[PDB]
Coordinates of C-alpha atoms and ligand atoms in Angstrom, one line a residue:
Chain A
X1 CA -20.6 -88.6 -27.9
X2 CA -22.1 -85.1 -27.6
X3 CA -21.0 -81.5 -27.1
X4 CA -21.4 -80.7 -23.3
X5 CA -23.5 -77.8 -22.1
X6 CA -24.2 -76.2 -18.7
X7 CA -26.4 -73.4 -17.9
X8 CA -26.9 -71.6 -14.5
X9 CA -29.4 -69.0 -13.2
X10 CA -29.2 -66.7 -10.2
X11 CA -32.9 -65.9 -9.6
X12 CA -35.6 -63.6 -11.1
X13 CA -35.4 -60.1 -9.5
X14 CA -36.2 -56.5 -10.1
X15 CA -33.5 -53.8 -10.0
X16 CA -30.0 -55.1 -8.9
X17 CA -27.8 -52.6 -6.9
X18 CA -24.4 -51.1 -7.8
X19 CA -21.4 -52.8 -6.2
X20 CA -23.6 -55.9 -5.9
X21 CA -24.1 -56.1 -9.7
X22 CA -20.5 -56.9 -11.0
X23 CA -20.2 -59.5 -8.3
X24 CA -23.5 -61.2 -9.2
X25 CA -22.2 -61.5 -12.8
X26 CA -19.0 -62.8 -11.4
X27 CA -20.8 -65.5 -9.4
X28 CA -22.9 -67.1 -12.1
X29 CA -19.9 -67.2 -14.4
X30 CA -17.8 -68.9 -11.8
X31 CA -20.5 -71.5 -10.9
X32 CA -21.2 -72.4 -14.5
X33 CA -17.5 -72.5 -15.3
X34 CA -17.1 -75.0 -12.4
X35 CA -20.0 -77.1 -13.5
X36 CA -18.7 -77.2 -17.0
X37 CA -15.2 -78.2 -15.8
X38 CA -17.0 -81.1 -14.2
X39 CA -18.5 -82.1 -17.6
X40 CA -15.2 -81.6 -19.6
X41 CA -13.6 -83.9 -17.1
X42 CA -16.1 -86.6 -17.9
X43 CA -18.5 -86.3 -14.9
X44 CA -22.3 -86.7 -15.1
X45 CA -25.0 -84.1 -15.7
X46 CA -26.1 -84.7 -12.2
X47 CA -22.5 -84.0 -10.9
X48 CA -22.3 -80.8 -12.8
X49 CA -25.6 -79.3 -11.6
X50 CA -25.0 -80.2 -8.0
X51 CA -21.5 -78.5 -8.2
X52 CA -22.8 -75.4 -9.8
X53 CA -25.8 -75.0 -7.4
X54 CA -23.6 -75.8 -4.5
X55 CA -21.2 -72.9 -5.3
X56 CA -24.1 -70.6 -5.8
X57 CA -25.3 -71.8 -2.4
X58 CA -22.0 -70.9 -0.7
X59 CA -22.0 -67.6 -2.5
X60 CA -23.6 -65.0 -0.2
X61 CA -25.0 -62.9 -3.0
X62 CA -27.5 -65.5 -3.9
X63 CA -30.7 -66.6 -2.2
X64 CA -29.8 -70.2 -1.5
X65 CA -27.6 -71.8 1.2
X66 CA -25.6 -68.9 2.7
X67 CA -27.3 -65.7 1.4
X68 CA -30.8 -67.2 1.9
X69 CA -33.7 -64.8 2.7
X70 CA -35.5 -65.0 6.1
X71 CA -38.8 -66.3 7.3
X72 CA -41.2 -64.2 9.4
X73 CA -39.2 -65.6 12.3
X74 CA -35.9 -64.1 10.9
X75 CA -34.9 -67.7 10.2
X76 CA -33.4 -69.6 7.3
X77 CA -35.5 -72.3 5.7
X78 CA -34.3 -73.7 2.5
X79 CA -35.7 -76.0 -0.3
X80 CA -33.9 -77.7 -3.1
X81 CA -34.3 -80.5 -5.7
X82 CA -32.2 -82.4 -8.2
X83 CA -33.3 -84.8 -11.0
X84 CA -31.6 -87.2 -13.4
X85 CA -32.8 -87.3 -17.0
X86 CA -31.8 -90.9 -17.6
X87 CA -34.0 -92.8 -15.3
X88 CA -36.0 -89.9 -13.8
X89 CA -34.3 -90.2 -10.4
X90 CA -35.1 -87.3 -8.0
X91 CA -34.2 -85.8 -4.7
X92 CA -35.6 -82.9 -2.8
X93 CA -35.7 -81.3 0.6
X94 CA -38.0 -78.7 2.1
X95 CA -37.8 -76.4 5.1
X96 CA -34.3 -77.5 6.1
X97 CA -32.6 -75.6 8.9
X98 CA -28.9 -75.3 9.6
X99 CA -27.5 -77.1 6.5
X100 CA -25.0 -75.3 4.4
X101 CA -25.7 -77.2 1.2
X102 CA -29.2 -78.4 0.6
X103 CA -28.6 -79.5 -2.9
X104 CA -26.1 -82.0 -1.6
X105 CA -28.6 -83.4 0.9
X106 CA -31.1 -83.6 -1.9
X107 CA -28.8 -85.5 -4.1
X108 CA -28.2 -87.8 -1.2
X109 CA -32.0 -88.2 -1.0
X110 CA -31.8 -89.4 -4.6
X111 CA -29.0 -91.8 -4.4
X112 CA -29.3 -93.2 -0.9
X113 CA -33.0 -93.6 0.0
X114 CA -36.0 -95.2 -1.7
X115 CA -37.7 -91.8 -1.6
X116 CA -37.5 -88.6 -3.6
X117 CA -38.6 -85.9 -1.1
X118 CA -37.9 -85.3 2.6
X119 CA -39.0 -82.4 4.8
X120 CA -38.1 -80.6 8.0
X121 CA -37.0 -82.7 10.9
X122 CA -36.9 -85.8 8.9
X123 CA -34.5 -84.3 6.4
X124 CA -32.4 -83.0 9.3
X125 CA -32.3 -86.5 10.9
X126 CA -31.2 -87.8 7.5
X127 CA -28.5 -85.3 7.2
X128 CA -27.1 -86.8 10.4
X129 CA -27.4 -90.3 9.2
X130 CA -25.4 -89.1 6.1
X131 CA -22.8 -87.6 8.4
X132 CA -23.6 -83.9 7.6
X133 CA -23.1 -81.4 10.4
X134 CA -25.6 -78.7 11.2
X135 CA -24.2 -75.2 11.2
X136 CA -25.4 -72.3 13.5
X137 CA -28.3 -70.7 11.6
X138 CA -26.8 -67.2 12.1
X139 CA -24.0 -68.3 9.7
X140 CA -26.4 -68.2 6.8
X141 CA -27.8 -64.8 7.7
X142 CA -26.3 -61.8 5.9
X143 CA -27.1 -58.3 7.2
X144 CA -28.7 -57.3 3.9
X145 CA -31.4 -60.0 4.5
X146 CA -32.2 -58.7 8.0
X147 CA -32.9 -55.3 6.4
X148 CA -35.0 -56.9 3.6
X149 CA -37.1 -58.6 6.4
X150 CA -37.2 -55.5 8.4
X151 CA -38.6 -53.6 5.4
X152 CA -41.0 -56.3 4.3
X153 CA -42.6 -56.2 7.8
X154 CA -42.4 -52.4 8.4
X155 CA -43.9 -51.5 4.9
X156 CA -45.9 -53.3 2.1
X157 CA -33.0 -68.9 -6.3
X158 CA -30.2 -70.6 -8.1
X159 CA -30.3 -73.5 -10.6
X160 CA -28.4 -75.2 -13.3
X161 CA -29.2 -77.6 -16.1
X162 CA -26.7 -79.7 -18.0
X163 CA -26.2 -81.9 -21.0
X164 CA -23.2 -84.2 -20.5
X165 CA -20.9 -85.9 -23.0
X166 CA -23.0 -89.1 -23.0
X167 CA -26.1 -87.0 -23.6
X168 CA -27.8 -87.3 -20.2
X169 CA -29.5 -84.2 -18.7
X170 CA -30.3 -83.1 -15.2
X171 CA -31.3 -80.0 -13.3
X172 CA -30.8 -78.6 -9.8
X173 CA -32.6 -75.8 -7.9
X174 CA -32.0 -74.4 -4.5
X175 CA -33.6 -71.6 -2.6
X176 CA -34.1 -69.6 0.5
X177 CA -37.7 -69.0 -0.6
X178 CA -39.5 -65.6 -0.6
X179 CA -38.7 -63.1 2.1
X180 CA -41.0 -63.2 5.2
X181 CA -42.6 -66.6 4.3
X182 CA -44.6 -68.2 7.0
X183 CA -42.8 -71.0 8.8
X184 CA -42.6 -74.3 6.9
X185 CA -43.8 -72.6 3.7
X186 CA -42.7 -74.7 0.7
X187 CA -42.2 -73.1 -2.7
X188 CA -41.7 -74.6 -6.1
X189 CA -38.0 -75.3 -5.9
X190 CA -38.2 -78.7 -4.1
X191 CA -41.1 -79.7 -6.3
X192 CA -40.5 -82.0 -9.3
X193 CA -42.1 -80.5 -12.4
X194 CA -42.4 -77.0 -11.0
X195 CA -38.9 -76.0 -9.7
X196 CA -37.4 -78.0 -12.5
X197 CA -37.6 -81.2 -14.6
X198 CA -35.2 -83.5 -16.4
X199 CA -35.8 -86.3 -18.9
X200 CA -33.3 -87.5 -21.5
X201 CA -36.1 -87.8 -24.0
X202 CA -36.7 -84.0 -24.0
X203 CA -34.4 -81.9 -21.8
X204 CA -34.0 -80.1 -18.5
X205 CA -35.4 -77.0 -16.9
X206 CA -34.7 -75.0 -13.8
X207 CA -37.1 -72.3 -12.9
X208 CA -37.2 -69.2 -10.6
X209 CA -39.8 -66.5 -9.7
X210 CA -43.1 -66.3 -7.7
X211 CA -43.2 -69.9 -6.4
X212 CA -46.9 -70.3 -5.9
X213 CA -47.5 -69.6 -9.6
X214 CA -44.7 -71.9 -10.7
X215 CA -46.4 -74.6 -8.7
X216 CA -49.8 -74.0 -10.1
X217 CA -48.7 -74.3 -13.8
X218 CA -46.0 -76.9 -13.2
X219 CA -43.7 -74.4 -15.0
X220 CA -40.7 -76.6 -15.6
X221 CA -42.8 -79.6 -17.0
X222 CA -44.7 -77.0 -19.1
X223 CA -41.6 -75.6 -21.0
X224 CA -40.8 -79.1 -21.8
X225 CA -44.5 -80.0 -22.8
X226 CA -44.2 -77.2 -25.3
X227 CA -40.8 -78.4 -26.5
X228 CA -41.8 -82.1 -26.8
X229 CA -44.5 -81.1 -29.4
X230 CA -42.2 -81.3 -32.4
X231 CA -41.5 -78.0 -34.2
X232 CA -40.6 -75.5 -31.5
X233 CA -37.3 -74.1 -30.3
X234 CA -36.2 -74.2 -26.7
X235 CA -36.5 -70.4 -26.9
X236 CA -40.2 -70.6 -28.1
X237 CA -41.1 -73.3 -25.5
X238 CA -39.6 -71.2 -22.7
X239 CA -41.7 -68.2 -23.7
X240 CA -45.0 -70.0 -24.1
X241 CA -44.6 -71.6 -20.6
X242 CA -43.6 -68.2 -19.1
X243 CA -46.3 -66.5 -21.2
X244 CA -49.0 -68.8 -19.7
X245 CA -47.8 -67.9 -16.2
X246 CA -47.8 -64.2 -16.6
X247 CA -51.1 -64.0 -18.5
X248 CA -53.0 -66.6 -16.5
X249 CA -51.7 -65.6 -13.0
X250 CA -49.7 -62.3 -13.2
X251 CA -46.7 -64.5 -12.2
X252 CA -43.3 -63.4 -13.2
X253 CA -40.0 -65.3 -13.2
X254 CA -37.6 -67.2 -15.3
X255 CA -36.2 -70.4 -16.4
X256 CA -33.2 -72.0 -18.0
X257 CA -33.7 -74.8 -20.6
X258 CA -31.4 -77.3 -22.3
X259 CA -32.7 -79.7 -24.9
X260 CA -32.0 -83.3 -25.8
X261 CA -29.8 -81.9 -28.7
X262 CA -27.7 -79.3 -26.8
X263 CA -29.8 -76.2 -27.5
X264 CA -30.1 -73.7 -24.6
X265 CA -31.9 -70.6 -23.5
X266 CA -32.4 -68.4 -20.5
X267 CA -35.7 -66.5 -20.6
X268 CA -37.3 -64.2 -18.0
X269 CA -40.5 -62.2 -17.6
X270 CA -39.4 -60.4 -14.5
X271 CA -37.1 -57.4 -14.7
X272 CA -33.9 -59.5 -14.6
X273 CA -32.4 -62.9 -14.1
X274 CA -28.7 -63.4 -13.8
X275 CA -27.6 -66.4 -15.9
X276 CA -24.6 -67.9 -17.6
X277 CA -23.8 -70.8 -19.8
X278 CA -20.8 -72.6 -21.1
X279 CA -20.6 -74.5 -24.4
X280 CA -18.0 -75.1 -27.1
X281 CA -15.2 -73.2 -25.3
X282 CA -17.2 -70.0 -24.8
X283 CA -18.8 -68.6 -21.6
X284 CA -22.0 -66.5 -22.1
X285 CA -23.5 -64.4 -19.3
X286 CA -26.1 -61.7 -18.5
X287 CA -28.4 -60.0 -16.0
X288 CA -30.6 -57.6 -18.0
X289 CA -31.6 -58.5 -21.5
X290 CA -29.0 -56.1 -23.0
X291 CA -25.7 -57.0 -21.2
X292 CA -25.2 -60.5 -22.8
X293 CA -21.4 -61.0 -23.2
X294 CA -19.4 -63.8 -24.9
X295 CA -15.8 -64.7 -24.1
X296 CA -13.3 -67.5 -24.7
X297 CA -13.3 -70.0 -21.9
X298 CA -10.6 -70.4 -19.1
Chain B
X1 CA -76.1 -75.1 -15.8
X2 CA -73.8 -78.2 -16.0
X3 CA -74.9 -81.5 -14.5
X4 CA -72.6 -81.9 -11.4
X5 CA -70.3 -84.9 -11.2
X6 CA -68.3 -86.4 -8.4
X7 CA -65.8 -89.3 -8.3
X8 CA -63.8 -90.6 -5.3
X9 CA -61.1 -93.1 -5.1
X10 CA -59.9 -95.2 -2.1
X11 CA -56.3 -96.0 -3.3
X12 CA -54.8 -99.0 -5.0
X13 CA -53.0 -102.0 -3.4
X14 CA -51.9 -105.6 -4.0
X15 CA -55.1 -107.0 -2.4
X16 CA -58.1 -106.3 -0.1
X17 CA -59.8 -108.8 2.3
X18 CA -63.5 -109.9 2.1
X19 CA -64.8 -108.8 5.5
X20 CA -63.5 -105.3 5.0
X21 CA -64.2 -105.3 1.2
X22 CA -68.0 -104.8 1.4
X23 CA -67.1 -102.2 4.0
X24 CA -64.6 -100.5 1.6
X25 CA -67.2 -100.3 -1.1
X26 CA -69.7 -98.8 1.4
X27 CA -67.1 -96.2 2.3
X28 CA -66.4 -94.8 -1.2
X29 CA -70.1 -94.9 -2.0
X30 CA -70.9 -92.8 1.1
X31 CA -68.2 -90.3 0.5
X32 CA -69.3 -90.0 -3.1
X33 CA -73.0 -89.4 -2.1
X34 CA -71.9 -87.0 0.5
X35 CA -69.8 -84.9 -1.8
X36 CA -72.4 -85.1 -4.6
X37 CA -75.2 -83.9 -2.2
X38 CA -73.0 -80.8 -1.6
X39 CA -73.0 -80.2 -5.4
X40 CA -76.8 -80.8 -5.7
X41 CA -77.3 -78.1 -3.0
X42 CA -75.2 -75.5 -4.9
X43 CA -71.9 -76.0 -3.1
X44 CA -68.7 -75.6 -5.1
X45 CA -66.5 -78.2 -6.6
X46 CA -64.0 -77.3 -3.8
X47 CA -66.7 -77.8 -1.1
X48 CA -67.5 -81.2 -2.4
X49 CA -64.0 -82.6 -2.7
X50 CA -63.2 -81.4 0.8
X51 CA -66.3 -83.0 2.1
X52 CA -65.7 -86.4 0.4
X53 CA -62.0 -86.5 1.1
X54 CA -62.8 -85.5 4.8
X55 CA -65.3 -88.3 5.1
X56 CA -62.7 -90.8 3.8
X57 CA -60.1 -89.4 6.2
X58 CA -62.7 -90.1 9.1
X59 CA -63.5 -93.6 7.7
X60 CA -60.9 -95.7 9.4
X61 CA -60.8 -98.3 6.5
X62 CA -58.7 -96.0 4.3
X63 CA -55.1 -94.7 4.6
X64 CA -55.8 -91.1 5.2
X65 CA -56.7 -89.3 8.4
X66 CA -57.8 -91.9 11.1
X67 CA -56.5 -95.1 9.6
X68 CA -53.3 -93.6 8.1
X69 CA -50.4 -96.0 7.7
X70 CA -47.3 -95.9 10.0
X71 CA -43.9 -94.4 9.3
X72 CA -40.6 -96.1 10.4
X73 CA -41.1 -94.7 13.9
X74 CA -44.6 -96.1 14.2
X75 CA -45.9 -92.6 13.9
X76 CA -48.7 -91.0 11.7
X77 CA -47.5 -88.3 9.2
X78 CA -50.1 -87.1 6.7
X79 CA -50.1 -85.3 3.4
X80 CA -52.9 -83.6 1.5
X81 CA -53.6 -81.1 -1.3
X82 CA -56.7 -79.4 -2.8
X83 CA -57.2 -77.3 -5.9
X84 CA -59.5 -74.9 -7.5
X85 CA -59.8 -75.4 -11.3
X86 CA -61.2 -71.8 -11.7
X87 CA -58.2 -69.7 -10.6
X88 CA -55.7 -72.4 -10.0
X89 CA -56.0 -71.8 -6.2
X90 CA -54.2 -74.6 -4.4
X91 CA -53.4 -75.6 -0.8
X92 CA -51.3 -78.3 0.6
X93 CA -49.8 -79.8 3.8
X94 CA -47.0 -82.3 4.2
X95 CA -45.7 -84.3 7.2
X96 CA -48.6 -83.3 9.3
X97 CA -49.1 -84.9 12.8
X98 CA -51.9 -85.2 15.3
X99 CA -54.5 -83.4 13.0
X100 CA -57.9 -85.1 12.4
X101 CA -58.5 -83.8 8.9
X102 CA -55.4 -82.9 6.9
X103 CA -57.6 -81.9 3.8
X104 CA -59.4 -79.2 5.7
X105 CA -56.1 -77.8 6.8
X106 CA -55.0 -77.7 3.2
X107 CA -58.0 -75.9 2.2
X108 CA -57.4 -73.3 4.9
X109 CA -53.9 -73.0 3.4
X110 CA -55.5 -72.1 0.0
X111 CA -58.1 -69.6 1.1
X112 CA -56.4 -68.1 4.2
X113 CA -52.7 -67.7 3.3
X114 CA -50.8 -66.2 0.3
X115 CA -49.1 -69.6 0.2
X116 CA -50.0 -73.0 -1.3
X117 CA -47.8 -75.5 0.6
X118 CA -47.0 -75.7 4.4
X119 CA -45.1 -78.6 6.1
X120 CA -44.3 -80.0 9.5
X121 CA -44.3 -77.6 12.5
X122 CA -45.3 -74.7 10.2
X123 CA -48.4 -76.6 9.2
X124 CA -49.0 -77.2 12.9
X125 CA -48.6 -73.5 13.9
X126 CA -51.0 -72.7 11.1
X127 CA -53.6 -75.1 12.5
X128 CA -53.4 -73.5 16.0
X129 CA -53.9 -70.1 14.4
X130 CA -57.1 -71.5 12.7
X131 CA -58.7 -72.9 15.8
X132 CA -57.9 -76.5 14.9
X133 CA -56.9 -78.8 17.7
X134 CA -54.3 -81.5 17.8
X135 CA -55.5 -84.9 18.8
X136 CA -53.4 -87.6 20.4
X137 CA -51.7 -89.5 17.6
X138 CA -52.6 -93.0 19.0
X139 CA -56.3 -92.4 17.9
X140 CA -55.3 -92.2 14.1
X141 CA -53.6 -95.6 14.6
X142 CA -55.4 -98.9 13.9
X143 CA -54.3 -102.3 14.9
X144 CA -54.3 -103.3 11.3
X145 CA -51.7 -100.7 10.7
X146 CA -49.5 -101.7 13.7
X147 CA -49.3 -105.2 12.2
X148 CA -48.6 -104.0 8.6
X149 CA -45.7 -101.9 10.1
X150 CA -44.4 -105.0 11.8
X151 CA -45.0 -107.3 8.8
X152 CA -42.9 -104.9 6.7
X153 CA -40.2 -104.2 9.4
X154 CA -39.5 -108.0 9.7
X155 CA -39.7 -109.5 6.2
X156 CA -38.9 -106.7 3.7
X157 CA -54.6 -92.8 -0.2
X158 CA -58.1 -91.2 -1.0
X159 CA -59.3 -88.5 -3.3
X160 CA -62.0 -86.8 -5.2
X161 CA -62.8 -84.7 -8.3
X162 CA -65.9 -82.6 -8.8
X163 CA -67.5 -80.6 -11.6
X164 CA -70.1 -78.4 -9.9
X165 CA -73.4 -76.9 -11.3
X166 CA -71.6 -73.8 -12.6
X167 CA -68.9 -75.9 -14.3
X168 CA -65.9 -75.4 -11.9
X169 CA -63.7 -78.5 -11.5
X170 CA -61.4 -79.5 -8.5
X171 CA -59.6 -82.3 -6.7
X172 CA -58.5 -83.3 -3.3
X173 CA -56.1 -86.0 -2.3
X174 CA -55.2 -87.1 1.2
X175 CA -52.9 -89.9 2.4
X176 CA -51.0 -91.3 5.3
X177 CA -48.2 -92.2 3.0
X178 CA -46.6 -95.6 2.4
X179 CA -46.0 -98.0 5.2
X180 CA -42.5 -97.8 6.9
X181 CA -41.6 -94.5 5.1
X182 CA -38.8 -92.4 6.5
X183 CA -39.8 -89.6 8.9
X184 CA -40.4 -86.5 6.8
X185 CA -40.9 -88.5 3.7
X186 CA -43.2 -86.5 1.3
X187 CA -45.1 -88.3 -1.4
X188 CA -47.0 -87.2 -4.4
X189 CA -50.3 -86.3 -2.5
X190 CA -49.5 -82.7 -1.4
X191 CA -47.7 -81.9 -4.8
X192 CA -49.6 -80.1 -7.5
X193 CA -49.4 -82.0 -10.8
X194 CA -48.7 -85.3 -9.1
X195 CA -51.3 -86.0 -6.4
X196 CA -53.9 -84.2 -8.4
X197 CA -54.5 -81.2 -10.8
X198 CA -57.6 -79.2 -11.5
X199 CA -58.0 -76.7 -14.4
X200 CA -61.4 -75.4 -15.6
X201 CA -60.0 -75.4 -19.2
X202 CA -59.5 -79.2 -19.1
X203 CA -60.6 -81.2 -16.1
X204 CA -59.5 -82.4 -12.7
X205 CA -57.6 -85.5 -11.6
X206 CA -56.6 -87.2 -8.3
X207 CA -54.1 -89.9 -8.3
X208 CA -53.0 -92.8 -6.1
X209 CA -50.2 -95.5 -6.4
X210 CA -46.4 -95.5 -6.1
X211 CA -45.7 -91.9 -4.8
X212 CA -42.1 -91.6 -6.1
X213 CA -43.1 -92.7 -9.6
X214 CA -46.2 -90.4 -9.5
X215 CA -44.1 -87.4 -8.9
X216 CA -41.4 -88.3 -11.4
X217 CA -43.9 -88.4 -14.2
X218 CA -46.2 -85.6 -12.8
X219 CA -49.0 -88.1 -13.3
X220 CA -52.1 -85.9 -12.8
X221 CA -50.7 -83.1 -14.9
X222 CA -49.9 -85.7 -17.6
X223 CA -53.4 -87.3 -17.7
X224 CA -54.6 -83.8 -18.4
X225 CA -51.9 -83.1 -21.0
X226 CA -53.1 -86.0 -23.2
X227 CA -56.7 -84.9 -22.7
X228 CA -56.0 -81.2 -23.7
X229 CA -54.2 -82.4 -26.9
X230 CA -57.3 -83.6 -28.7
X231 CA -58.1 -87.0 -30.3
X232 CA -58.6 -88.6 -26.9
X233 CA -61.4 -89.6 -24.5
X234 CA -60.9 -89.3 -20.7
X235 CA -60.5 -93.1 -20.8
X236 CA -57.6 -92.9 -23.3
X237 CA -55.9 -90.0 -21.6
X238 CA -55.7 -91.9 -18.3
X239 CA -54.6 -95.2 -20.0
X240 CA -51.7 -93.4 -21.5
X241 CA -50.6 -91.4 -18.4
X242 CA -50.8 -94.6 -16.3
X243 CA -49.3 -96.8 -19.1
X244 CA -46.4 -94.5 -19.3
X245 CA -45.7 -94.4 -15.6
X246 CA -45.7 -98.3 -15.6
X247 CA -43.6 -98.6 -18.9
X248 CA -41.1 -95.9 -17.9
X249 CA -40.8 -96.7 -14.1
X250 CA -42.7 -99.9 -13.4
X251 CA -44.8 -97.7 -11.1
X252 CA -48.4 -98.9 -10.7
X253 CA -51.3 -96.8 -9.5
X254 CA -54.7 -95.3 -10.5
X255 CA -56.5 -92.1 -11.1
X256 CA -60.0 -90.5 -11.1
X257 CA -60.7 -88.0 -13.9
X258 CA -63.5 -85.6 -14.7
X259 CA -63.3 -83.4 -17.7
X260 CA -64.7 -79.9 -18.0
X261 CA -67.7 -81.3 -19.9
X262 CA -68.8 -83.9 -17.3
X263 CA -67.2 -87.1 -18.5
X264 CA -65.3 -89.1 -15.9
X265 CA -63.4 -92.3 -15.6
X266 CA -61.7 -94.3 -12.9
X267 CA -58.6 -96.1 -14.0
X268 CA -55.9 -98.2 -12.4
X269 CA -52.8 -100.4 -13.2
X270 CA -52.7 -101.9 -9.7
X271 CA -54.8 -105.0 -9.0
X272 CA -57.6 -103.0 -7.4
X273 CA -58.7 -99.5 -6.6
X274 CA -61.9 -98.6 -4.7
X275 CA -63.9 -95.9 -6.3
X276 CA -67.4 -94.6 -6.7
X277 CA -69.0 -92.0 -8.8
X278 CA -72.3 -90.2 -8.6
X279 CA -73.9 -88.4 -11.6
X280 CA -77.6 -87.7 -12.1
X281 CA -79.7 -90.3 -10.3
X282 CA -77.2 -93.2 -10.4
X283 CA -74.2 -94.4 -8.2
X284 CA -71.3 -96.3 -9.8
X285 CA -68.9 -98.3 -7.6
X286 CA -66.1 -100.9 -7.8
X287 CA -62.7 -102.3 -6.7
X288 CA -61.6 -104.8 -9.4
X289 CA -62.3 -105.0 -13.1
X290 CA -65.4 -107.4 -12.9
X291 CA -67.2 -105.8 -9.9
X292 CA -68.6 -102.5 -11.1
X293 CA -72.2 -102.0 -9.9
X294 CA -74.5 -99.2 -10.9
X295 CA -77.3 -98.4 -8.5
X296 CA -80.1 -95.8 -8.2
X297 CA -79.1 -92.9 -5.9
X298 CA -80.5 -93.0 -2.4
Ligands
LIG301 N1 -39.1 -69.9 -6.6 C1 -38.6 -69.4 -5.2 C2 -38.4 -67.9 -5.3 C3 -37.6 -67.5 -6.5 O1 -37.6 -68.1 -7.5 O2 -36.9 -66.4 -6.4 C4 -39.7 -69.8 -4.2 O3 -40.8 -69.4 -4.2 O4 -39.5 -70.5 -3.2
LIG302 N1 -49.5 -91.9 -3.3 C1 -49.3 -92.2 -1.9 C2 -49.4 -93.8 -1.8 C3 -50.7 -94.3 -2.3 O1 -51.4 -93.5 -3.0 O2 -51.1 -95.5 -2.0 C4 -48.0 -91.8 -1.3 O3 -46.9 -92.3 -1.7 O4 -47.9 -90.9 -0.4
NA303 NA1 -26.1 -68.5 -1.5
NA304 NA1 -59.3 -92.7 7.1

């Protein structure tokens, strides 16, 4: 009968703008609030992370769902994955077009098919089978992302992790990818062990950053490798994982980690990663390393 | 200069016939000699796994390339992945249709793009960009696989590791999937850490078996985790990884492992798994526990 925890992240970045910045803070707080409210109410770890990531999908400030970056086609292709710590259940979708909430489709892949990963037109056909509508792809496009893709041609992720009241853990990750990706490019976010991992015997991670690197070191399984070795903190394990990515590959990013026991951290190696957690009636939140707030829950 | 090594596997099942069993053994032996002849000539670990995996794709007796199993729609959809132990270079393709050699596409993903993983139509557009030609899909279909699909719709993989002369390690895995899979179903094969892993600091692995289980435990990455911990032979590291997958998930499968020092093992918890290894002047081969033969290299 354990003390619930939920942690969310809003994606490793560089400098965040002005008006944009209070609102990003506001977003993670509201998604992690919601996911925690799911847990207080007695719902599962899996329920909480889906809810949190689904709100950060619908939120246009974040690169997942609505708000997703564009491919070299000026097109939205999204990846996402969810896992259950109890029995290792998993669900994931890659290169999905015209679906407002991939994390939901992914959880449907988990509960309703004997598989863990569907891609492209097959995940589209499945969305229909599940009774999910496609939306016009223009709906997911914000004008800021057209200018990002214009620039990236001219010149030169959200997640949550939860411990529920019965002690189960789970993670969820959802992305638009990296701006100007080739068509049908798949990052780490739909990939079990890279975009996140969940196992009740250790804990749960959700990662963000340069996807190819995350893939190559199995970043999420790696934080947990370090944590399952006996005498390390979640905070240490996070940094060793992320250290190995930076130093081995020049790969920056971040993750969020919650342990079997309720411990949690949000670490990043890139310039910033908006995050928030909820535990024991307080809500924590930050973007840079030096704006951490605490505040009594609502 | 290290003594080069090369192992291949032909995937594990419930049973194999007797007319096509001598022919299965011949197949893994030939792909192994082919790949190992590349290493003897000064080709890279990566050259040799592409070459052996590509031969096995072309050998119609194996569920990869020509001879790939059928999805629910009686169609062929293929996955493959390849990895460079030296810099963690990786390349992958999922849900690939009408291409003769999915492993060679995956390698062109590694060397020719800034990405690691392409899927579906994106993989296809990348193939046309590379000069590769679609084939009609009927010619990857065997009659054996038309009848499996029906046997399953009524009632109810290949890979390689190398250590080259300069001591680089690598793997390649290619499959047609599992019979009667959902369109767009992605298995462990194109997934780094699950279908295989290669890291010069440890060794390289290629897996086969229950795809969903393989991904949930990150089976290749795990084999290698035990091995990097110390106190373990390659034999033990693979018993534990596979023993865990089976104890935690009832998932059965196999792997081929080669450590950075030249020691290799082939290991399965399925009834059988075809494999061959070449090292020095001798060729090892087998399917079941009591049928390992060691013969002078030709
Ligand atoms: N991991 C994401 C990008 C990010 O984390 O911001 C991807 O490569 O698909
Ligand atoms: N691992 C393969 C199946 C096998 O190896 O037999 C897949 O599920 O895609
Ligand atoms: Na969003
Ligand atoms: Na074949």
